[PDB]
Amino acid sequence: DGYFKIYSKHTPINLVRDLPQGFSALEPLVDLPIGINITRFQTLLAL
Amino acid sequence: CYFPLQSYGFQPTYGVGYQPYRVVVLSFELLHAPATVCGPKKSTNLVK
Ligand SMILES: *[C@@H]1O[C@H](CO)[C@@H](O)[C@H](O)[C@H]1NC(C)=O
């Protein structure tokens, strides 16, 4: 309904490569009253 | 042929209505996207 919602979690981990077996829940980070359609996304990385 | 614009000259001696008057219009748009401007929700002292 035009609101763009982000939820997020940070944790320390000590593991080689895979997504970890275990349970945790994302807290709400921020909610933005944007009002745009979104149908495609892209990611931004450091060189 | 005419230049399509004219300057006002406002000099402080002119009659009322011939004088310069600033104008501002708050035009606003409704409800097709999330409510993004509105007034202070007035609030009152806390009772228990
Ligand atoms: C989002 O998509 C719908 C369906 O095509 C359209 O009615 C709406 O106006 C679009 N929103 C914007 C901001 O273009």
First to last CA, chain B: 78
Q: What determination technique applies here?
A: cryo-EM
Give chain A's radius of gyration (CA, Å).
15
Instruction: Determine the Cα–Cα distance for residues A44 and A36; give it in Å rounded to an integer.
Output: 20
Pocket lined around ligand 1, Cβ cut-off 6 Å: A 36-37
Count residue pairs from A and B with Cβ separation < 8 A.
11
Chain A, nearest residue to B31 by Cα: A35
Instruction: Determine the Cα–Cα distance for residues A31 and A27; give it in Å rounded to an integer.
Output: 12
Instruction: Determine the Cα–Cα distance for residues B28 and B37; give it in Å rounded to an integer.
Output: 10
The maximal CA–CA distance of chain A, rounded, in angstroms, is 40
